[PDB]
Amino acid sequence: GHMVEIGELAPDFELPDTELKKVKLSALKGKVVVLAFYPAAFTQVTFRDSMAKFNQVNAVVLGISVDPPFSNKAFKEHNKLNFTILSDYNREVVKKYNVAWEFPALPGYVLAKRAVFVIDKEGKVRYKWVSDDPTKEPPYDEIEKVVKSLS
Template sequence: MLEIGDEAPDFTAPLANGDVESFTLSDRLDEAPLVLAFFPAAFTSTCTTEMCTFRDRMANFEDVGAAVYGVSIDTPFTLNEFRRQNDLNFALVSDTNREIIHDYDVSMDFDSLGVRNVAKRAVFVVDADETVSYAWVSDDPGAEPDYEEVAAAAESARN
């Protein structure tokens, strides 16, 4: 698992921002700190609550100059619809190839449902040096991050 002080794995993936564009982490470091909020699946209850909470608290991140990106294995088209229906004010990264969740070591299975290789609920804050300055990973898909702690970590990463 990635820990504070580790180099954040670089990646390129589709970005759902109303359109579908390409997102490369290393090309976005000028937006740092970057908050990468991994979630298992769009349109599920806890994932919707989590992404809507980030939406509702976006001012906390904007105030410290941080950019928030959700990351899931959903297609960019699904993620754009999820953004639209929930009025999300940040973009979502599509990891349909499951490379990012493997590189960040946040892959999990829902064995009882026969669902494999989805993202654990996790949050990483990446600073301008591409270093992980905050890491939270949960094995409980019903858990949510401490949003105030994430905002404080983003603020610290800015300084």
């Protein structure tokens, strides 16, 4: 089964972005990468989604959800997200990162937990945060300090 720990090589993957362009994690070696998993585009709470808090991060942020690319494109534009948003539509990556759960109101609907992984220039996992509660937000300040140490 899948378990991701600090110090391990981050599991590689290739997913389509909002323009259906294939994005491969390992092609980003040489750059700090932040994986930002979210349960669902257009989750309602506010004028802008919390994913916009990654706009200011000094790294290559990959937002990842199981939403289809067409909807993620509208979500990206509506919320002025300035970074790549990927669609894990077959749930390959939520499984590889062990961040899958079933949405309570939708039997058999598997989606990402709210999670963040920071990956160094060598492709190793250097920070991990996974919340079972989808409404919690990650500690952005700590994440940015980790990114700084890897830059």
